[PDB]
Structures are given as C-alpha cells and as structure tokens.
Write an enzyme that holds these catalytic residues in place. Structure first.
Site, PDB file in Angstrom:
ATOM      1  N   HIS A 190      -8.404  -6.902  -0.859  1.00 42.26           N
ATOM      2  CA  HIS A 190      -6.843  -6.354  -1.420  1.00 42.26           C
ATOM      3  C   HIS A 190      -6.704  -6.768  -2.684  1.00 42.26           C
ATOM      4  O   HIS A 190      -6.774  -7.969  -3.071  1.00 42.26           O
ATOM      5  CB  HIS A 190      -5.892  -7.093  -0.494  1.00 42.26           C
ATOM      6  CG  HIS A 190      -4.452  -6.675  -0.916  1.00 42.26           C
ATOM      7  ND1 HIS A 190      -3.975  -5.450  -0.566  1.00 42.26           N
ATOM      8  CD2 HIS A 190      -3.477  -7.161  -1.852  1.00 42.26           C
ATOM      9  CE1 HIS A 190      -2.645  -5.347  -0.905  1.00 42.26           C
ATOM     10  NE2 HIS A 190      -2.363  -6.482  -1.718  1.00 42.26           N
ATOM     11  N   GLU A 247      -7.058 -11.849   1.685  1.00 42.18           N
ATOM     12  CA  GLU A 247      -8.034 -10.839   1.679  1.00 42.18           C
ATOM     13  C   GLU A 247      -8.814 -10.629   0.739  1.00 42.18           C
ATOM     14  O   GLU A 247      -7.985 -10.227  -0.274  1.00 42.18           O
ATOM     15  CB  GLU A 247      -7.086  -9.837   2.183  1.00 42.18           C
ATOM     16  CG  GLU A 247      -6.570  -9.834   3.609  1.00 42.18           C
ATOM     17  CD  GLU A 247      -5.474  -8.928   4.124  1.00 42.18           C
ATOM     18  OE1 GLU A 247      -4.961  -8.989   5.219  1.00 42.18           O
ATOM     19  OE2 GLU A 247      -5.237  -7.880   3.336  1.00 42.18           O
ATOM     20  N   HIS A 292       0.791  -1.176  -0.203  1.00 44.21           N
ATOM     21  CA  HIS A 292       0.014  -0.019  -0.212  1.00 44.21           C
ATOM     22  C   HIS A 292       0.686   1.182   0.053  1.00 44.21           C
ATOM     23  O   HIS A 292       0.675   2.156  -0.809  1.00 44.21           O
ATOM     24  CB  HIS A 292      -0.989  -0.028   1.153  1.00 44.21           C
ATOM     25  CG  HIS A 292      -2.154  -0.641   0.929  1.00 44.21           C
ATOM     26  ND1 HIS A 292      -3.060  -0.254   0.347  1.00 44.21           N
ATOM     27  CD2 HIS A 292      -2.502  -1.755   1.469  1.00 44.21           C
ATOM     28  CE1 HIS A 292      -4.088  -0.743   0.172  1.00 44.21           C
ATOM     29  NE2 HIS A 292      -3.730  -2.261   1.060  1.00 44.21           N
ATOM     30  N   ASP A 337      -7.978  -1.327  -1.385  1.00 38.71           N
ATOM     31  CA  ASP A 337      -8.995  -2.084  -0.408  1.00 38.71           C
ATOM     32  C   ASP A 337     -10.527  -1.777  -1.163  1.00 38.71           C
ATOM     33  O   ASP A 337     -10.720  -0.666  -0.844  1.00 38.71           O
ATOM     34  CB  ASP A 337      -8.979  -1.868   0.816  1.00 38.71           C
ATOM     35  CG  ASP A 337      -7.697  -2.616   1.287  1.00 38.71           C
ATOM     36  OD1 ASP A 337      -7.196  -3.416   0.674  1.00 38.71           O
ATOM     37  OD2 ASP A 337      -7.110  -2.164   2.504  1.00 38.71           O
TER      38      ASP A 337
HETATM   39 ZN   LIG Z   1      -5.078  -3.921   1.250  1.00 42.79          ZN
END
Ligand SMILES: [Zn+2]
EC number: 3.4.13.22
Length: 202
Positions: free
Chosen positions: A184, A181, A116, A123
């Site tokens: 992501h 995730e 990030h 996200d």
């Molecule tokens: Zn992320």
C-alpha cells in the site's frame, strides 16, 4: 470514465497489472462489487507519480505490477459485508490464517473507509526487469497478517530488503507508505483527500 481519473495503464504504459478485485483471486473469492473491468483505475496525479515510480525502477531493473488503485465505496462495502459473513474457509489459509474476518477490520487491514476510494492509493509490487520474475516480498497481496507489515520479522533479509526497495521507489516518487501493508502506497499530496468516490471501475 469519470473526470480526473484514468485507467493507469493508459498513462503508465509498460506497467503490469492484475486487478485482483475484478477477478476471483482475491480474499472474497469472487469479483468485488464496483469492479466491472480488469483494469487499474486511478487519479491522473496517481498515474503521473506512478509513471515516475515506474521510471525510478531504474533503482535496479524493477518493473511495477499493479493490483489495485481506485476502489469504489461499494467495493469497500462489499468487503465489509464479506467480513460479516460466516467462515467458509475458502480463502482463509491464503489470505488470513492467524486472524479471522472480524479481526481483519479491527487491525487496520480492511478499511471501513478506504484511501483507495479517493483515487490516489495504489497496491503494487516489483518484478525483476531482467529475469521477468516477481521480486519476493515474503507475503502475498492482501495477506492480512503481521507478516505483511513493512517492519515485519519472519521475513528473510532479501524479502525485507525487497520491501524496503519498493517503499523507497514509492517514497522517492511522491508516495507515502503504510506500515501494516508493504504493498500500500498513497500519493502524498493527492488531489482529493476527503472525497470518497463511488463510480464503478468500468
Ligand atoms: Zn492499498
């Protein structure tokens, strides 16, 4: 605003966002250091490909809700510092039942170093364009559990299919998913791999 970066909403125009880390509604319970603005910042190339993703949510009437883009290194340190604090049980139930703060790093859920900070990770979820409601995904943003994995079971067929649709929209739009995730996504050929920035989201 840093050069090569932008507030993603200034490129991706009807996009929904909620900069979770500029807010008290994240797993640390307070705003995260480096997030001074409730906006999603990102690399222009992230913005470009998010725009393609926004448009490709034509694959059904899906809109995008962004939660986090560029994340300052100090934001990443703030998370690490938080993971090292005593458990006050303030956000444990909602964000990490079944593991503890420590394990949230051991298990690849919180990164020492984050993609990030390079400005090309994002996200997000989908919401229904017709209905305006959030597309159910089975777990919350930053849920920090095996439930949040893309391949996870204990998630209904709809929820699993929904995650697959987010993933496909993203993969078809120049992104790479991440197994652990469902929210992501990193730009596949990002302008600054190996560069982890630390200018504030401001
Ligand atoms: Zn992320």
């Amino acid at each position: 605003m840093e050069i090569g970066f932008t507030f993603l909403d200034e490129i991706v125009h009807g996009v929904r966002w909620d900069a979770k880390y500029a807010t008290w509604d994240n797993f640390t319970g307070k705003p995260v250091d480096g997030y001074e603005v409730n906006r999603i910042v990102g690399t222009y190339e992230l913005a470009e490909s998010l725009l393609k993703a926004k448009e490709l949510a034509a694959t059904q009437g899906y809109g995008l809700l962004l939660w986090d883009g560029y994340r300052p290194k100090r934001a990443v340190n703030c998370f690490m510092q938080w993971a090292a604090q005593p458990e006050n049980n303030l956000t444990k139930e909602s964000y990490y039942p079944n593991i503890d703060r420590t394990e949230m790093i051991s298990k690849g859920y919180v990164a020492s170093k984050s993609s990030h900070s390079r400005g090309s990770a994002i996200d997000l979820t989908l919401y229904r364009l017709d209905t305006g409601e959030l597309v159910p995904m089975g777990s919350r943003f930053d849920f920090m559990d095996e439930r949040s994995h893309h391949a996870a079971n204990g998630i209904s067929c709809n929820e699993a299919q929904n995650r697959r649709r987010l993933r496909s929209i993203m993969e078809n739009s120049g992104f790479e998913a991440y197994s652990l995730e469902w929210w992501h996504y990193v730009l596949r050929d990002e302008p600054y791999p190996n560069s982890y920035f630390d200018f504030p989201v401001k």
